[PDB]
């Protein structure tokens, strides 16, 4: 979903259920690809 071809809009919403795997939340914050990565309920360091 970061390297996809086409994205949707706010009128037609895309949903993707992801489960049963092993992730890495450290690579989503140090890479210079975004500007706003602020969170609401969970701290970004404690996600791992």
């Amino acid at each position: 979903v970061f390297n996809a071809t086409r994205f949707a809009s706010v009128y037609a919403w895309n949903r993707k259920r992801i489960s049963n795997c092993v992730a890495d939340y450290s690579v989503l914050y140090n890479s210079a690809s975004f500007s706003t990565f602020k969170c609401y309920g969970v701290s970004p360091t404690k996600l791992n």
């Binding site: 309920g41 969970v42 701290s43 360091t45 404690k46």
Partner: protein
């Protein structure tokens, strides 16, 4: 009024500038529960006296 009742659930989710606020809602809510038990038992101790 906090997020959860377990103190281990708030320290392992929140940053300590934010986790202090949810902990402080649990300290005040549990201090008034202890002061009601002591006050209600000081009148029962006078009735049994």
């Amino acid at each position: 009024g906090a997020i959860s009742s377990v103190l281990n659930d708030i320290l392992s989710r929140l940053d300590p500038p934010e986790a202090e606020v949810q902990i402080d809602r649990l300290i005040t809510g549990r201090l008034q529960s202890l002061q009601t038990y002591v006050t209600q038992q000081l009148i029962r101790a006078a009735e049994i006296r």
